[PDB]
């Protein structure tokens, strides 16, 4: 199983960002997709997951209005769509994949993350 993260960099605070992650080595369509991050002095934490029947699930506070989760099963890749960033955004952002977890940070598999940073 690989997992790969991409579209992290720099942005300015108010900015929006779109990450994406392509998976190979298991059949897609049948695992749970999700974000996790982990920024400065915090533990790893959820962001969001889609569950492999389309079901979207966020994390607390700045997540179901600022966020949006995708998947597209042709193409075996799934997305982050952020809004609205902030400084305290700044974070590794991981994709990660398992059969049957949504928020628990104990997904299967995981990727080696991408890193943004928002600015003040």
């Known amino acids: 199983v690989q997992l790969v993260e991409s579209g992290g960099g720099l942005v300015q605070a108010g900015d929006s960002l779109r990450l994406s992650c392509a998976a190979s080595?298991?059949?897609?369509?049948?695992?749970?997709m999700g974000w996790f991050r982990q920024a400065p002095g915090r533990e790893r934490e959820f962001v969001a997951s889609?569950?492999?029947?389309?079901?979207?699930?966020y994390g607390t506070d700045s997540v179901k209005g600022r966020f949006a989760i995708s998947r597209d099963n042709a193409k075996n890749t799934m997305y982050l769509q952020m809004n609205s960033l902030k400084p305290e955004d700044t974070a590794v952002y991981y994709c990660?994949?398992?059969?049957?977890?949504?928020?628990?940070?104990?997904?299967?598999?995981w990727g080696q993350g991408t890193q943004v940073t928002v600015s003040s």
């Open positions: 889609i569950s492999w029947s389309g079901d979207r699930t």
């Open positions: 080595g298991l059949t897609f369509n049948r695992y749970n």
């Open positions: 990660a994949a398992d059969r049957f977890l949504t928020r628990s940070v104990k997904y299967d598999y």
